[PDB]
Amino acid sequence: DKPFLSAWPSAVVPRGGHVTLRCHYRHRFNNFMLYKEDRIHVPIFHGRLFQESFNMSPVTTAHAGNYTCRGSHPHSPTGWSAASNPVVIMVTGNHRKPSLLAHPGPLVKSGERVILQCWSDIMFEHFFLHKEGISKDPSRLVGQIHDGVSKANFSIGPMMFALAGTYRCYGSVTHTPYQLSAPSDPLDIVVTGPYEKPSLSAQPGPKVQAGESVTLSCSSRSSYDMYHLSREGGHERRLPAVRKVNRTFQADFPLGPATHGGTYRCFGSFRHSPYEWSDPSDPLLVSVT
Amino acid sequence: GSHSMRYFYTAMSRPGRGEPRFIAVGYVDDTQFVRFDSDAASPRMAPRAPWIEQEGPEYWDGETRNMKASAQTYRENLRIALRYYNQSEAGSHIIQVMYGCDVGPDGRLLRGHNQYAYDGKDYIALNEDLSSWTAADTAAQITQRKWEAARVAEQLRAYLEGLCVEWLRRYLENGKETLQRADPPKTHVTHHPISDHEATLRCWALGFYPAEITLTWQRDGEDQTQDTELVETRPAGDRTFQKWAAVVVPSGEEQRYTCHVQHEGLPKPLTLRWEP
């Protein structure tokens, strides 16, 4: 006899944002009370009967907490239902952001693993890794302390498309565990493969004199709707593919007016899946005189 | 006789009412033999017919791992389908998946199947050649382009030609005494008046396996297919099935009507008539 509690659009919410708690019980979204973990059996707001979902807006730090709901059950020894599943509202933006980096890198072969390392010069007690999206839950790790930084290694994988996307990480300090830092700079984690690798080539070719034009052509018999041109160490270009007479799919990346060059690979991708890339093309080295 | 194995997946979003939910069931012919439900506590593939229960722990661990993986896959495919059709994140949607194989009496593959649906309508299907797709709309054409670029048909084909037939042959052995023994229907005819000049004759077939059956009413040998009311074949709950067929007849003409029953468990078709 448990209600189902949920937060929308995200239980991880910036301060000043908005989150709605919904309590669904016996085919209804009404007539329920809320409780916080530290003070159970004492309803919040002096026992406010929520006749509708609870919209917290704008979100403040006082909204952060670990919630359960009980729905009105009129013929019962308490008059109320059992406690719902717990939902933890985490309010972000309350400390300087940590940093997030991928080892060995953010392009992850299908089936393989990647470490996402969160770290800060602030002594965070816990670190949270959150993948962008509606109704997405964070992973938590204790912060390890060494050499004046705290850090945590989040292991992601075996990589597949459900794990690809934009990640951010967060720190919390000892006595405000439901208050999170500002988010780290975002990191896009991309899965490469198993879509077949395209072909890379340059026009007129890979040897460019100063002041001459170089265009990089990514090509495939697969119908990629977009190609990503990726340079070793840089520069991340995207272009739509166009179908050619010989049935190849192709995008032409003009370089210049003074690109210095380097080794290039290209990847195909598809509409509405921006973090699923094909296998990398064979590399192509461009040298500007 | 011929035999078939099918797996059926249902993946459902239900925003604000539950977590995204993945349900899988496995069938040999008309007999359910396994299930997985991501809503249970500690989801796992579980036996649903006695003849699978003595598969070892290596079987269930491999099945449970596969189902957990597919639940994660199809939870995300629901989000993808939202973008393909430009639908709100507040509504409830359903993906359905079917695959499996048909084998002949020698146990060799006759054909493979793999079809997908979104919100109860065809979405994409593997063709009979097991190496190409037919897409039902422009959203599914995106999926087709992706599955072509990833050579997904080759993986379906390897399974349908290999493990699918191999396991179906094993399950048919495990449950031979129930899966390959046709139980004939027990039959009778009932009579009820609807007025002072018409009555209903109802031909009953009970306790039969497998579910395939033909019940017909004849009058002077002519098939009363248009005047016959046939109910959907229905499960008894004990792995047999039930069906009936009714016709409305002029009172006093009951002797003209015969019910005909065809079923794998009958060595010859049965003819029935009602008698006071």
Partner: peptide, 10 residues
């Protein structure tokens, strides 16, 4: 036994 489909997306 069920089909094991590695990493396949719609």
């Amino acid at each position: 036994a069920s089909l094991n489909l590695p990493a396949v997306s719609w």
